[model samples]
Target: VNSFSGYLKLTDNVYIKNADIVEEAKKVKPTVVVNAANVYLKHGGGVAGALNKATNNAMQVESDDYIATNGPLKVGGSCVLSGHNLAKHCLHVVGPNVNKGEDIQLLKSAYENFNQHEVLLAPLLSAGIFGADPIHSLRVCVDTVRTNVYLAVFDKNLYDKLVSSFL
Candidate 1:
């Protein structure tokens, strides 16, 4: 988390705390929020580890359709989901923490006010976190917003892979 924050220089401004998702949302007043939880791994688990797991999950699900690769983006910089005929735009997001989440909120808020100007908003979840729990945490955070739509997409192969590997 700190790595991405430092790289983005968002470490100083944003605040991260453990609290109720709704309460946190009220305090931040962000447009989009990501919830990530930490899970134990034998290795030195961190942002990179979480991302690897997420990518692996995505790969397994999509199989020939989607491919996961490394890019210039830092640990939790961005993700691309392609081959899905339904989704035109790729869902990209930074890691879930103080800075990244805040950045996402700012972008969404601006898009809402300036571009779409819609009353309701929908946001994506961060996939890579310890034990893949951060994604779940993001869900809780978004629920607090009470938005009209909460959109999420997972590769069927990846979902099956995770269940087979982890569960």
Candidate 2:
């Protein structure tokens, strides 16, 4: 297999990268780091867990506060707050579960819910435990993000597939 680690400019400002989301966030120091979150908004596993760890669980505390203030986030909804460590802010979006008869519109809605900041770093939404197809998810990501943004693909297999889709 060939080793490929680089980013592609999908549009004027949108980008897709084959790299760890957390590391990219550290490098970019974006206006916000997007977490592919759960409905409850708790910082659990996957990208959510990594972001929480990066902030020494301060992110989780903020997430808890967000939920307490706004109540549970519905599927395809999103929220934002200060990202205590990595960046100025963190944007949390709740994507739809693939097994639940989710359509492309629902997935697109999650990406659409993004608050366009100066710069954004996000993982491939719904592609992990949420069970989204990598190619479709990347398609949605690149198609939706309008502002300056980096779509980070942490899994190598997924990265390869996404690259193939774009190229």
Candidate 3:
């Protein structure tokens, strides 16, 4: 279906990568990795789960204790879960409810200053546990995050969808 492997810039260097999250993570070695936390810091699913383990569930506990409006982190505001994995810090952001996606604000807000570092790597956020349409998620992240947002999508079909969304 395609000619090559890896990733490509969908727009303005916002990339769609087809590889392993943890694997590529080491390569990029970003300073901050965003935690696509839900209304309750559901770090037991998707990338959050993976990172939760990598951090020894430090983020899960940290997110639980940290105060916010309706959930863990404020829609736009972020908190740091540090001291593990390739990333030095995990920027916790509470997004919309996975079962009932609604807030566009939270999604965009999560990455508001989103451009605070050289390697602010983003997972294929909202697509898995949040049940968000990958294309839609990719669009907003690439559009809103005023940084070189790089997405990690392991599935081939989903990766293709991400590429098509920008095309």
Instruction: Compare the candidates by lDDT and give the number of the best one.
Output: 2
- TM-score, structure 2 vs. true: 0.87
Error of 1 at 49 (Å): 16
Report the poorest 10 consecutive residues by lDDT, candidate 1. 1-10
Ranking of models by lDDT: 2, 3, 1
lDDT of each: 0.30, 0.78, 0.66
Give the per-residue lDDT digits (tens) of candidate 1, residues 1-167. Answer: 11111111112222222233323233333343232221111112333233224344442244223323332333333333331221222223333344334433332222222122111112333343322343343433343333232222233454344334331
Residue 157 of model 3 has an lDDT of 82
- The top-ranked prediction according to TM-score is 2
lDDT, candidate 2, at 39 = 83
Which stretches of candidate 3 lie above 4 Å from their native place?
1-6, 64-71
TM-score of 3: 0.79
Per-residue lDDT tens digits for candidate 2, residues 75-155, read 888888887767778888888878666664688889886645656778878888788887888778767866667788887
Clashes of each: 8, 0, 0
Candidate 2 wrongly placed segments (more than 4 Å): 1-6, 99-104
Using TM-score as the measure, what is the rank order of every candidate, best first?
A: 2, 3, 1
Better of 1 and 2 by TM-score: 2
